[PDB]
């Protein structure tokens, strides 16, 4: 996301605006203003590692843009945006992740490595790998009898088609000691 | 399958279990996943976009 302080009406600010947005969700319900649009309308550009070196970035679009004029003792604890030179904003942090991790619920609540582990196991889980399993003649293949889309989810699964072709089941779980088995 | 199509490799110089590369680099932010890398042997040498 580009920042360009170029706002007559005030300080610095994300090129893209609530209009562009609603203009896309407009193209959504139609299933003519795509991604390649946001791009050619110099509202968002590609940054490789080299270039990235010479730019400043904001995490949240909002939280890192207004001035100052309490806080929830339950939410985490963010630092601040006492920066003025902001040249770009992060479309969203969660995208630092990959296909594996994007299915981990609340990864920002686990011990770093545990997420590395789960990232490995899901590639050994069972589910439905393609709806045409019935017509494919591959050696060895596993289909879960009754796939269930997971209760707790991720905005990113939405693109990994995970709700469509799940890979597990919502099991009722008791975390207790019992027979000792 | 998705995860397999976004896979990265990196050869080494034998022995080279040195960790200078294997380590999660700063610049890796945003381009590679900080959590999804294999354990042991080729850990850190195999990244995921």
């Amino acid at each position: 996301f580009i920042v360009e302080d170029d706002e007559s009406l005030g300080h610095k600010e994300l090129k893209v605006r609530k209009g562009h947005i609603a203009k896309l969700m407009a193209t959504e319900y139609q299933d003519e203003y795509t991604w390649s649009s946001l791009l050619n309308e110099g509202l968002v550009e590609y940054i490789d590692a080299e270039e990235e070196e010479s730019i400043l970035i904001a995490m949240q679009p909002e939280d890192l843009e207004p001035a100052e004029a309490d806080v929830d003792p339950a939410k985490r604890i963010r630092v601040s945006h006492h920066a003025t030179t902001f040249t770009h904003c992060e479309i969203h942090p969660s995208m630092i992740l990959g296909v594996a991790a994007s299915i981990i619920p609340f990864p920002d609540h686990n011990q770093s490595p545990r997420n590395t582990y789960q990232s490995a196991m899901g590639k050994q889980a069972m589910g439905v790998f393609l709806t045409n399993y019935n017509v494919r003649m591959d050696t060895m293949a596993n289909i879960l009898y009754y796939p269930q889309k997971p209760l707790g989810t991720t905005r990113a699964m939405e693109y990994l088609k995970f709700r469509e072709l799940p890979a597990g089941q919502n099991a009722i779980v008791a975390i207790a000691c019992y027979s000792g088995y | 399958t998705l995860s397999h199509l976004r896979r990265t490799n990196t050869p080494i110089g034998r022995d080279g279990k040195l960790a200078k590369p294997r380590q999660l680099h700063n610049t890796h932010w945003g381009l590679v996943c900080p959590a999804e890398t294999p354990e042991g042997q080729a850990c850190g040498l195999v990244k995921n976009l």
């Binding site: 795509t34 969203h92 995208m95 693109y159 | -």
Partner: peptide, 30 residues
């Protein structure tokens, strides 16, 4: 106000749009 700021939930829209055009296997194809 088609030119107001953008909240957080609004970013998802951009993304929804990203994958609609590029898609998960982008690079392996291009």
């Amino acid at each position: 106000d088609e030119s107001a700021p953008i909240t957080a939930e609004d970013s998802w829209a951009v993304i929804s749009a990203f994958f609609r055009e590029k898609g998960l296997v982008s690079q392996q194809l291009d």
